[PDB]
Ligand binder design. Structure first.
Ligand SMILES: *[C@@H]1O[C@H](CO)[C@@H](O[C@@H]2O[C@H](CO)[C@@H](O[C@@H]3O[C@H](CO[C@@H]4O[C@H](CO)[C@@H](O)[C@H](O)[C@@H]4O)[C@@H](O)[C@H](O[C@@H]4O[C@H](CO)[C@@H](O)[C@H](O)[C@@H]4O[C@H]4O[C@H](CO)[C@@H](O)[C@H](O)[C@@H]4O)[C@@H]3O)[C@H](O)[C@H]2NC(C)=O)[C@H](O)[C@H]1NC(C)=O
Ligand SMILES: *[C@@H]1O[C@H](CO)[C@@H](O[C@@H]2O[C@H](CO)[C@@H](O[C@@H]3O[C@H](CO)[C@@H](O)[C@H](O)[C@@H]3O)[C@H](O)[C@H]2NC(C)=O)[C@H](O)[C@H]1NC(C)=O
Ligand SMILES: *[C@@H]1O[C@H](CO)[C@@H](O[C@@H]2O[C@H](CO)[C@@H](O)[C@H](O)[C@H]2NC(C)=O)[C@H](O)[C@H]1NC(C)=O
Ligand SMILES: *[C@@H]1O[C@H](CO)[C@@H](O)[C@H](O)[C@H]1NC(C)=O
Ligand SMILES: *[C@@H]1O[C@H](CO)[C@@H](O)[C@H](O)[C@H]1NC(C)=O
Ligand SMILES: *[C@@H]1O[C@H](CO)[C@@H](O)[C@H](O)[C@H]1NC(C)=O
Lengths: 109, 48, 51, 134
């Protein structure tokens, strides 16, 4: 678990501890407490249907930036366990979902 | 070309102390590789 | 050395692929065919050339 | 609509088998791949294994092959068996699909690509408790 706090109506960046050893194809999962998780961003660039535009993916530029989930306009329901399902050509098969950065929102009415 | 090749290597570096017993392991990869990349670690004589 | 440095391959940054050489199949087919038309001169009026 | 409903015993003794099913509705069975998801209280979402259309069960190596997963097109449900169950297996058990996307970085003729599995549609999930309790 990785704790993080952000203010209301602000923009947040969500990263994971794993590094992109080579070309990466990350999947982003948002697991609400009790509620079932939902895939937010996959393929580093695409967002499945039925998802708000508050999250933008991090494209692949052959190097550099890691999986940075850009939460534009964080809401109250964003307090959940965010998962960085990272896949690359070096670590082989990612049989684990890694450590989940539990983001919580403070300063709410 | 042959004689001109050797005269370009004689002032270069010699690697006679290079090949010691190399503990070579396969590079960080998954299945269906072929090898072709040996991560070798070895003792090397430093300046001293 | 003193002052002698074995340039070795460090960690390969990025994706691990293997080397290749591309050649336009349209040109290479046409190039080899132009050779068979010339190579058929030195062996019979018409023979089967295999590569 | 793809509806993934799970049903299980809920209570189980140590050294027993946890056989939980996952019913899919509103869609076919041979459209995508299927898997389960577990999460112990205090831990994160861990993957247990996935099955594709060819019924070949691929297990997560982080559980020492102590799981047997299968599916039945008759009931159109996904089964899951666990032998040598530890009390630490008291957790939530999710059920989700798997869209196996092909990410390409090199050339295809040399096998320089890899398949990444993406869980697009999930299920509600059912919780089971394993202990010496009866
Ligand atoms: C000789 O001829 C062969 C055969 O045509 C050439 O082979 C091709 O080489 C290219 C370059 O290495 C390969 O490119 C990669 O393709 C994938 C898939 O996209 C398409 O794939 C088909 C084949 O299935 C191909 O025909 C299309 O032209 C096209 O390429 C791309 O996803 C991939 O994108 C990038 O990958 C690198 C990986 O390091 C990454 O750094 C970069 O950012 C791109 O990432 C993508 O994905 C991220 C998300 O993870 C996203 O954010 C980015 O926007 C990108 O979408 C790359 O282009 C090609 O697959 C290969 N296959 C074939 C059969 O064509 C060969 O190159 C040529 N000659 C020589 C000398 O190389
Ligand atoms: C082939 O094997 C070598 C040796 O294991 C690999 O190199 C080593 O890789 C590790 C990381 O896996 C490096 O560790 C890190 O180094 C940085 C240096 O600033 C340090 O800050 C970190 O805390 C950590 O120790 C290590 O330095 C590096 N080299 C050595 C001499 O051990 C190499 O990466 C392998 N090949 C490939 C392509 O992975
Ligand atoms: C560098 O020299 C040292 C000399 O001790 C080597 O160390 C031994 O290596 C063997 C094989 O891995 C081990 O079984 C011994 O326990 C090591 N001894 C000690 C004291 O560490 C070392 O392996 C050499 N490195 C290389 C790769 O050449
Ligand atoms: C490891 O090294 C052996 C011996 O060189 C080789 O046959 C094998 O393909 C390499 N890689 C793997 C994945 O075992
Ligand atoms: C090599 O690359 C150049 C530049 O893209 C292209 O014009 C040429 O046709 C390529 N040759 C082959 C063999 O594909
Ligand atoms: C190769 O190209 C030449 C020129 O276009 C053509 O005459 C020949 O039939 C081609 N060969 C094959 C096998 O397509």
């Amino acid at each position: 678990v990785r704790p993080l706090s952000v203010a209301l109506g602000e923009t947040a960046r969500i990263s994971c501890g794993r590094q992109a050893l080579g070309s990466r194809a990350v999947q982003w999962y948002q697991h609400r407490p009790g509620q079932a998780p939902i895939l937010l961003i996959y393929n580093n660039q695409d967002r499945p249907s039925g998802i708000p535009e508050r999250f933008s993916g991090t494209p692949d530029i052959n190097f550099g930036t890691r999986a940075t989930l850009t939460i534009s306009g964080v809401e109250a329901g964003d307090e959940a366990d965010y998962y960085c399902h990272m896949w690359d050509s070096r670590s082989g098969f990612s049989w684990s979902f890694g450590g989940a950065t539990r983001l919580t929102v403070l300063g709410q009415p | 070309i042959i004689s001109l090749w050797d005269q370009s290597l004689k002032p270069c570096v010699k690697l006679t102390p290079l090949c010691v017993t190399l503990q070579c392991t396969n590079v960080t990869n998954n299945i269906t590789d072929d090898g072709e990349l040996k991560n070798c670690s070895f003792n090397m004589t430093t300046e001293l | 050395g003193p002052g002698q440095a074995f340039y070795a391959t460090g960690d390969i940054i990025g994706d691990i692929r293997q080397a290749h050489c591309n050649v336009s199949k349209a040109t290479w087919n046409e190039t080899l065919g132009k050779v068979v038309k010339q190579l058929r001169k030195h062996f019979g009026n018409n023979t089967i050339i295999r590569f | 609509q793809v509806q993934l409903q799970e049903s299980g015993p809920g209570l189980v003794k140590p050294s027993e088998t946890l056989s939980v099913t996952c019913s899919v509705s509103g869609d076919s069975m041979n459209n995508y791949y299927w898997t389960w998801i577990r999460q112990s209280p205090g831990k994160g979402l861990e993957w247990i294994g996935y099955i594709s259309d060819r019924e070949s069960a691929t297990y997560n190596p982080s559980l020492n092959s102590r799981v047997v997963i299968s599916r039945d097109t008759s009931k159109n449900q996904l089964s899951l068996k666990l032998n040598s169950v530890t009390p630490a297996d008291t957790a939530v058990y999710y059920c989700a699909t798997a869209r196996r996307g092909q990410r390409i970085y090199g050339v295809v003729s040399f096998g320089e690509f890899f398949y990444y599995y993406s869980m697009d549609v999930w299920g509600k999930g059912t919780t089971v408790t394993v202990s010496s309790a009866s």
